Amino acid sequence: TVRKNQATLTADEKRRFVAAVLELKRSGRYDEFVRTHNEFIMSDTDSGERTGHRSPSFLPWHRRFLLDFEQALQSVDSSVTLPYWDWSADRTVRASLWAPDFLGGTGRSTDGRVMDGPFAASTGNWPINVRVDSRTYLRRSLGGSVAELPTRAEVESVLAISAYDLPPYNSASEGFRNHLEGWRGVNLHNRVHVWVGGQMATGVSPNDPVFWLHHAYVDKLWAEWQRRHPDSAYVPTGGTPDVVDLNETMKPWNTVRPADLLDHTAYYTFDAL
Amino acid sequence: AAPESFDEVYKGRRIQGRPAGYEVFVDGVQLHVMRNADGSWISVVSHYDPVPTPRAAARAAVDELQGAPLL
Ligand SMILES: [Cu+]
Ligand SMILES: [Cu+]
Ligand SMILES: [Cu+]
User: Fold this and answer.
1) Residue B67: Cβ-neighbour burial (10 angstroms; 0-12, 13-18, 19+)
2) Residue A201 and residue B71: Cβ atoms within 8 Å?
3) Does B32 show up as a binding residue in the annotation?
4) Which ligand has the nearest atom to the CA of A52?
5) Cβ-Cβ contacts under 8 Å, B45 against chain A
6) Min distance B46 CA to chain A CA atoms (Å)
7) Which positions does UniProt annotate for Cu(2+) 2 binding (chain A) (predicted)?
8) Which of A35, A47, A133, A174 best probes binding to B when mutated, by most B CB atoms within 10 angstroms?
């Protein structure tokens, strides 16, 4: 029940994590996570209903989505937990994260195809089924579309924002959530997706296993922000059209509300917070 | 006030845009695109990288596809 920095995983943990992910893929369960994500990415709009992204619920929604995935992994191997990727620290193509024994590296320049690691198309173990770009192999272009990953300094500026979110509660909002998501400011979360490239830069981003590690760290940053701002909390708190208020339930689960996810310790703890 | 329509061949592929709120096609296949509050645009194949216009989004898609047909 402890989420660890990917850079600290043991050979066995990396092996077990990879095997569990591959089994969810084989059984067909994995693709459904990709499909669900793409559905919300496609429906969440700044002028209307928005639940998964560009809205205050971006954080609690992804927290629950990751819990769903982690629980699926644990149903295969109960010792497995979602590790997190601190992109402010491990910012190069040489991070152990991109080694052949973990996620594999960047894609070749010709077609962006990943050629090593357990998720390379050549293994016959990672078909890209849920897709828009008709190609069926995992693709990446680390640092191709955007020069640099967020720095610790930039992350710090965002963690310093006191307000969780602010009206109009969308991509135009000032405040922590939108600055963390990246639609405004130095850009943290959005920039990481762009930096990885390939499927990670699309609506079907969960096709790349790194998606979970990326969001596991974004999730950790929310928990850190809470520690710095004990006097701030989730908003809005009631009667906001098209936005998930604190005590309102969230789709697709319908049985959980942001209020039920604010405290991560009810589900897991971090190696270090 | 939706943007104007467009039709051109970009990197050997035909890209078209037209007000619906706005539709984009790559070689006759529709591409999901979205407008942000600040006026920028994104598409399903480049959803985390805002660009100034729908044509910019279509061109970004063609770039991303590297010749591959759109589903
Ligand atoms: Cu997402
Ligand atoms: Cu969209
Ligand atoms: Cu994301």
Assistant:
1) exposed
2) no
3) yes
4) 1
5) 132-133, 201-203
6) 5
7) 37, 53, 62
8) A133
- Residue ranges per domain, chain A? 1-273
Query: By a Cβ cutoff of 8 Å, what residues of chain A touch chain B?
Result: 38, 41-42, 45-47, 54, 111-112, 131-135, 145-146, 168, 170-172, 182-183, 189-191, 193-194, 201-203, 205
Min Cα separation A172/chain B (Å): 6
Full set of structural domains in chain B with CATH: 5-66 (3.30.1880.10)
- Please give the method by which this entry was determined: X-ray
* Ligand in nearest proximity to the CA of A42: 2
Resolution (angstroms) equals 1.6
